């Protein structure tokens, strides 16, 4: 039905989608200002790590500080093949994409990192309250020259 | 309130019940879950140590692979299930946890727990593509397989 509440849900979803689009297309020096898309207390980070616990960066200003690190470690990163999924919750989106770029971690050789990624984006008052990245850490191991453990799958 | 929109709302409602049934299937019922798929439907694991998916193609193959997975994961349960509808009535995402005994040939019996994202694409009210995304490092741990530790220097 065309009710005021349905219209507000649509307007919210439309505004939030634009912010996900902006986030996913932010490159180069603009990455240093991407934290401004978050709530003051917004969280972002990497939910799939070798330790099994997330690396969560808490707060808009922490996210900005971290972005200085990221731009060194991934100096030319781009997201590609971006597919944005709206959900029944106008404040929750998922993205499936790929990503490629140089990886420059201290203690490892410089390499070329490519992966497939899923991102979750939760909004509040039109700003990102929680962003989470999910990927396969094994691909990042390969990019760093770290030997990837193998699972034998007998009888599969 | 057009019949196009009405067709889509029903498609989505129907597909969501299929996703619910899939996610709640346990025990011997797992032997018949393949019946939820199109004849040519594909299921499998998109996040693997090799970087390549383990794609199980076809309803009959899916039913055959269920026999092996009921040996390897005899008491598997999905929990904490959150279903996400999308703008496509034939595309859903699920975020959930899962755990169970892991009983692979040639590895100590373990307890495997992980966080999962599942993609479900439909055609004609059945599953045409199911894809599981997880952190393989957690499966390594469950099998006693050593997991390398990525050092993140400069990380605040
Ligand atoms: O892209 C950035 O600006 C960025 C900013 C923060 Br803060 C953390 C990580 C970042 N980028 C990496 C690229 C490789 C895949 N993981 C995310
Ligand atoms: O649960 C099933 O019946 C099942 C069926 C097929 Br065919 C393949 C794998 C299965 N289970 C594993 C459990 C641990 C996480 N990955 C999925
Ligand atoms: O490891 C998984 O969770 C898994 C997921 C999907 Br789908 C299919 C097969 C899987 N594992 C095989 C490994 C070899 C022994 N049989 C179980």
């Amino acid at each position: 039905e065309n009710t005021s509440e349905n219209r507000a849900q649509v307007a919210a979803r439309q505004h939030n989608r634009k912010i996900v689009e902006q986030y996913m297309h932010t490159r180069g020096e603009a990455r240093l200002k991407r934290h401004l898309l978050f709530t003051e207390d917004g969280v972002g980070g990497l939910w799939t790590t070798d330790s099994g616990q997330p690396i969560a960066i808490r707060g808009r200003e922490k996210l900005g500080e971290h972005a200085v690190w990221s731009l060194q470690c991934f100096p030319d990163w781009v997201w590609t093949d971006i597919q944005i999924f709206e959900t029944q919750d106008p404040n929750w989106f998922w993205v499936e994409c790929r990503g490629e770029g140089a990886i420059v971690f201290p203690g490892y050789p410089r390499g070329q990192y490519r992966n497939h990624f899923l991102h979750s984006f939760r909004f509040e008052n039109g700003l990102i309250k929680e962003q989470r990245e999910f990927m396969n850490p094994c691909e990042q191991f390969r990019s760093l020259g770290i030997e990837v453990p193998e699972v034998r799958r007998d009888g599969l």
Side-chain angles (χ1 to χ4, degrees), chain A residues 151-156:
Chain A
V151 176
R152 290 232 214 171
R153 286 212 164 65
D154 271 71
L156 170 72

Side-chain angles (χ1 to χ4, degrees), chain A residues 59-78:
Chain A
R60 178 199 283 142
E61 289 306 309
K62 291 282 157 82
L63 282 160
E65 298 167 358
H66 220 75
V68 178
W69 172 77
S70 180
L71 186 70
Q72 302 166 3
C73 293
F74 302 103
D76 64 358
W77 189 254
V78 301

Side-chain angles (χ1 to χ4, degrees), chain A residues 29-102:
Chain A
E29 299 297 313
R31 290 153 64 183
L32 300 172
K33 296 186 187 179
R34 197 183 59 189
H35 64 297
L36 301 180
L37 301 180
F38 290 73
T39 55
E40 181 168 298
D41 65 347
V43 174
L46 175 56
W47 256 243
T48 49
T49 69
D50 72 70
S51 78
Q53 295 298 313
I55 298 158
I57 303 145
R58 309 176 180 279
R60 178 199 283 142
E61 289 306 309
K62 291 282 157 82
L63 282 160
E65 298 167 358
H66 220 75
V68 178
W69 172 77
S70 180
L71 186 70
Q72 302 166 3
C73 293
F74 302 103
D76 64 358
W77 189 254
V78 301
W79 304 111
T80 62
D81 299 277
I82 292 163
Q83 304 182 263
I84 295 169
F85 298 97
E86 302 166 0
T87 77
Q88 71 269 30
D89 181 340
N91 286 310
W92 204 333
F93 288 71
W94 293 86
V95 179
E96 177 172 9
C97 65
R98 285 176 195 279
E100 183 176 298

